[PDB]
A paper describes a structure:
The spike (S) glycoprotein of SARS-CoV-2 mediates receptor recognition and viral entry into cells. It forms homotrimers protruding from the virus surface and, once engaged with the host-cell receptor–human ACE2, undergoes a substantial structural rearrangement to fuse the viral membrane with the host-cell membrane. The S protein is also the primary target of the humoral immune response during infection. A large number of SARS-CoV-2 neutralizing monoclonal antibodies bind S protein, especially its receptor-binding domain (RBD), providing a basis for vaccine development.
We carried out cryo-EM study to delineate structural changes of the Kappa S trimer, and obtained two cryo-EM maps, including a one RBD-up open conformation (termed Kappa S-open) and a transition state (termed Kappa S-transition) at 3.2- and 3.4-Å resolution, respectively. For the open state, the angle between the long axis of the up RBD-1 and the horizontal plane of S trimer is about 72.5°; while for the transition state, this angle is 44.1° with the RBD-1 appearing less “up”, and the other portion of S-transition is in similar conformation to that of the S-open. Moreover, the population distribution of the S-open versus S transition is ~49.1–50.9%, in sharp contrast to our previous findings that, for the WT S trimer, the S-open occupies only 6% and the S-closed about 94% of the population. Accordingly, with the downward movement of NTD and the underneath SD1, the fusion peptides (FPs) of the Kappa S-open were also disordered as in the other open state S trimer structures. In the meanwhile, the up RBD-1 slightly upward tilted about 3.4° (from 69.1° to 72.5°) relative to that of the G614 S. Interestingly, the analysis revealed a “breath” motion of the fusion machinery, especially in the S1 region. In the collective motions, the three coordinated NTD-RBD pairs (including NTD-1/RBD-2, NTD-2/RBD-3, and NTD-3/RBD-1) tilt outward/downward simultaneously, thus the entire machine untwists and appears more expanded, which could release the protomer interaction strength, beneficial for the transient raising up of the RBD and shedding of S1 subunits. We showed previously that for the WT S, the core region of the up RBD-1 (through Y369/F374) can form aromatic interactions with the RBM T470-F490 loop of the neighboring down RBD-2 (through F486/Y489). Here for the Kappa variant S with E484Q mutation in the T470-F490 loop, contacts between RBD-1 and RBD-2 within 4 Å were reduced to just between Y369 of RBD-1 and N487/A475 of RBD-2, which could disturb the constrains between RBD-1 and RBD-2, facilitating conformational landscape shift towards the fusion-prone open state. All these may render the Kappa variant S more prone to receptor binding and subsequent fusion.
Residue numbers in the entry:
A (entry chain B): 729 to 827, 854 to 1067
B (entry chain A): 641 to 676, 689 to 728
C (entry chain C): 292 to 340
D (entry chain C): 535 to 620
E (entry chain A): 923 to 1147
F (entry chain A): 826 to 827, 854 to 873
Write the structure that this text describes.
């Protein structure tokens, strides 16, 4: 969903603590200004993804103190108030498996992880009590036993199967959730899709910093060395080479971020679409909510992303 | 009015414990707004009112009335 | 430079011109003559005297 | 005026069509500029008048022709300009 | 429904007339293009390391071999300006083509036909949409069915009469505290429980929460008459 | 909802009237 927000300063990166280098940078016009406005926009778009995705509801929903789920055990998917931060037992694993002075600034996100869990809790508590109604209008409480009955009638299965096999469906479901906890705990690569985002940003930042060590044809990469050696008119020749190359480095970084910014926004739109079709309501689309006939889905918070548990027939 | 946040030091904003709807986004779930002798204030972003849905095996809600709404969507 | 048809062949780098519209050049109008307007040459010193 | 020419006024040069405009420069202002810091107008160094600079007509040349196997007929299209050369 | 609809369209005219920011999505496209064009032009006044930004000035001062050195700096920098412009236009074009595909999809599912997708045509159950032309874009007015008022009722999963569990063929079982009625989920329209409104499946010893009631058989008075 | 350096604004293929007739 979201990517690391980075604000790069084109004044400090190109010219460290240098007056002469700065004056020579003005000759290149708005390059510095423009490169900052672009990254500024990307950082803002990252917050739009969370709003367009994580929050599908204007209200917060909570579960009653007396829990009758009709045989299903949601203790794993629902937040645990005993924990210091509000999260479920599955989200606890999702957060654990996934994890400068040159003018690179990491901007904090507008939406904290705790608030993201509160959005998930609202969606979870809603589907349990209100079923499919809260998304399309005012919250209408329905007994969960009748909710699954309507969800089977939607896929072509007479609801009589539920009431008769309700005990069996309770064992298959609970046993399935247990496999999710075992898989996510044992297998750390299931979230690799999210780890790739972290690795991609790290390589871009690391590469951008390593360019500072390159001479770019200049005698030396350090500006103070050039100022402490060559004459004022001679230093301009060497300083221009450093500025020219360092300028290209920022253009490469920014260009790479805008491209990846188009990839993340595409996935964010998918997450927002699935929460509407798969989570809030029941989707008739084929293999959109996953293999099998879709019944209902559980949203779960994950670092810089979201996880969907799709219950299918 | 010198306070600290996760984004950094913020001067010129009063801290209001009451949570309101985000107006001017800052960061780390903090937002600013101009309100009541009115001055800039800092507050925690509110996620909306808490609604506890009555849930019981025998309880259900059947809509007694409806409303036809018209939504406006724009695309380039 | 024979005709616009040839300009299309030279723009496409091909002997066969496919059906459609293609931009073979950029039209521009050149200046007809050079104009010069300067302040008056007056306020001479009496160097002749 | 009213023609495409290469003009040199005081220390400024350029090519374009000079026409009398309604703009008014202050007594001390010899030439104006645009939002882009390009000169859209000038004041005659000798006389007192204001002349707007309209760039000489330019545009793309598009050739409209059917397939070679169809016919060799061609139709020239001068973009962003009225009929001038012909 | 005639008053709710007509009154709704009136609010659309008042909202668009009073609020000019609802179209800001389209105004952004105009602003982004203006900044790119304004920027691209203003870069011509930059020196790019050259002595001066004017070409004729360098040519009219430095010697032919010295001028080429300075002119190359202008050509190199100005060339990078175009690369930056074209690069941004290609990226922004991808954002517009994505929106265009979305607009073409909505007209098919929302406007032309009726869409069953959740919140694709807007909040509520989608009925039909009105396309409207907008500068460098399009506007969609989506008429939806939103439930308003509800009332809490007593429900049961099944009814037991002759010993065989009865299930609703359509709707749900509700009660006002006296008799059990059948009703649709989207609205409250009491309907007597009958063999035609219910289906016979299994027995009464399986379903959890089944209740006992009298299922009316329309064939009884027909046979007695 | 609402140059001289050689930047050309190309006209649209379909006029505002045609899109309104769709």
């Amino acid at each position: 969903v979201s990517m690391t927000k980075t604000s790069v300063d084109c004044t400090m990166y190109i010219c460290g603590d240098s007056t002469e280098c700065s004056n020579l940078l003005l000759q290149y016009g708005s390059f510095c200004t423009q490169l900052n406005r672009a990254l500024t926009g990307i950082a803002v778009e990252q917050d739009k993804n969370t709003q367009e995705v994580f929050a599908q509801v204007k209200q917060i929903y909570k579960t009653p103190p007396i829990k009758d789920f009709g045989g299903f055990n949601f203790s794993q998917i629902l937040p645990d108030p005993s924990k210091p931060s509000k999260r479920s037992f599955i989200e606890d694993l999702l957060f654990n498996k996934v994890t400068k002075f040159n003018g690179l600034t990491v901007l904090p996100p507008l939406l904290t992880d705790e608030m993201i869990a509160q959005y998930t809790s609202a969606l979870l508590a809603g589907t349990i009590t209100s079923g499919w109604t809260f998304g399309a209008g005012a919250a209408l409480q329905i007994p969960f036993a009748m909710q699954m009955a309507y969800r089977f009638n939607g896929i072509g299965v007479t609801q009589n199967v539920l009431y008769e096999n309700q005990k069996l469906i309770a064992n298959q479901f609970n046993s399935a959730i247990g496999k999710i906890q075992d898989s996510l705990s044992s297998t750390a690569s299931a979230l690799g899709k999210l780890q790739d985002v972290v690795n991609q940003n790290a390589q871009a930042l690391n590469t951008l910093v390593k360019q500072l060590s390159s001479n770019f044809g200049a005698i030396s990469s350090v500006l103070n060395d050039i100022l402490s050696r060559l004459d004022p008119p001679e230093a301009e020749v060497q300083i221009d080479r450093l500025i020219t190359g360092r300028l290209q480095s920022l253009q490469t970084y920014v260009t790479q971020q805008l491209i990846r910014a188009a990839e993340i926004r595409a996935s964010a739109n998918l997450a927002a679409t699935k929460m509407s079709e798969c989570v809030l309501g029941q989707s008739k689309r084929v293999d959109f909510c996953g293999k099998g006939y879709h019944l209902m889905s559980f949203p779960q918070s994950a670092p810089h992303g979201v996880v969907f548990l799709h219950v299918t027939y | 009015n010198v306070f600290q946040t996760r984004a950094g030091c913020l001067i010129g904003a009063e801290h209001v414990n009451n949570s309101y709807e985000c107006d001017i986004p800052i960061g780390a779930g903090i937002c600013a707004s101009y309100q009541t002798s009115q001055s800039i204030i800092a507050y925690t972003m509110s996620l909306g009112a808490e609604n506890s849905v009555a849930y019981s095996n025998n309880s259900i809600a059947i809509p007694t009335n409806f409303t036809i709404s018209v939504t406006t969507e724009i695309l380039p | 430079a024979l005709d616009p048809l040839s300009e299309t062949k030279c723009t496409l780098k091909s002997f066969t011109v496919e059906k459609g519209i293609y931009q073979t050049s950029n039209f521009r109008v050149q200046p007809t003559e050079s104009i010069v307007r300067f302040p008056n040459i007056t306020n001479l010193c009496p160097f002749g005297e | 005026k009213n023609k495409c020419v290469n003009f040199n006024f005081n220390g400024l040069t350029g090519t374009g069509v000079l026409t009398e405009s309604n703009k008014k420069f202050l007594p001390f202002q010899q030439f104006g500029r645009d939002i882009a810091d390009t000169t859209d107008a000038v004041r005659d160094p000798q006389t007192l008048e204001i002349l707007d600079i309209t760039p000489c007509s330019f545009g793309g040349v598009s050739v409209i022709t059917p397939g070679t196997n169809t016919s060799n007929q061609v139709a020239v299209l001068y973009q962003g300009v009225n009929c001038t050369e012909v | 429904i005639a008053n709710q609809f007509n009154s709704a369209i009136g609010k659309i005219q008042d909202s668009l007339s009073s609020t000019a920011s609802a179209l800001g999505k389209l105004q952004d496209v105009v602003n982004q293009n203006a900044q790119a064009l304004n920027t691209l032009v203003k870069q011509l006044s930059s020196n790019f390391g050259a002595i001066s930004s004017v070409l004729n000035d360098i040519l009219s001062r430095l010697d032919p071999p010295e001028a080429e050195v300075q002119i190359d700096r202008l050509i190199t920098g100005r060339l990078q300006s175009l690369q930056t412009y074209v690069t941004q236009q290609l990226i922004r074009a991808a954002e517009i083509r994505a929106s265009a595909n979305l607009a073409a999809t909505k007209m098919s599912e929302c406007v032309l036909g009726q869409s069953k997708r959740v919140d694709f045509c807007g909040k509520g159950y989608h009925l039909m949409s009105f396309p409207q032309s907008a500068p460098h874009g399009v506007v969609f007015l989506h008429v939806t069915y939103v439930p308003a008022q509800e009332k809490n009722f007593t429900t049961a999963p099944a009814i037991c009469h002759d010993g065989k569990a009865h299930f609703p063929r359509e709707g749900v079982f509700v009660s006002n505290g006296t008799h059990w009625f059948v009703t649709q989920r989207n609205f409250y329209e009491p309907q007597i429980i009958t063999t035609d409104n219910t289906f016979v499946s299994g027995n009464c010893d399986v379903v959890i929460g089944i209740v006992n009631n009298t299922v009316y058989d329309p064939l009884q008075p027909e046979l007695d008459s």
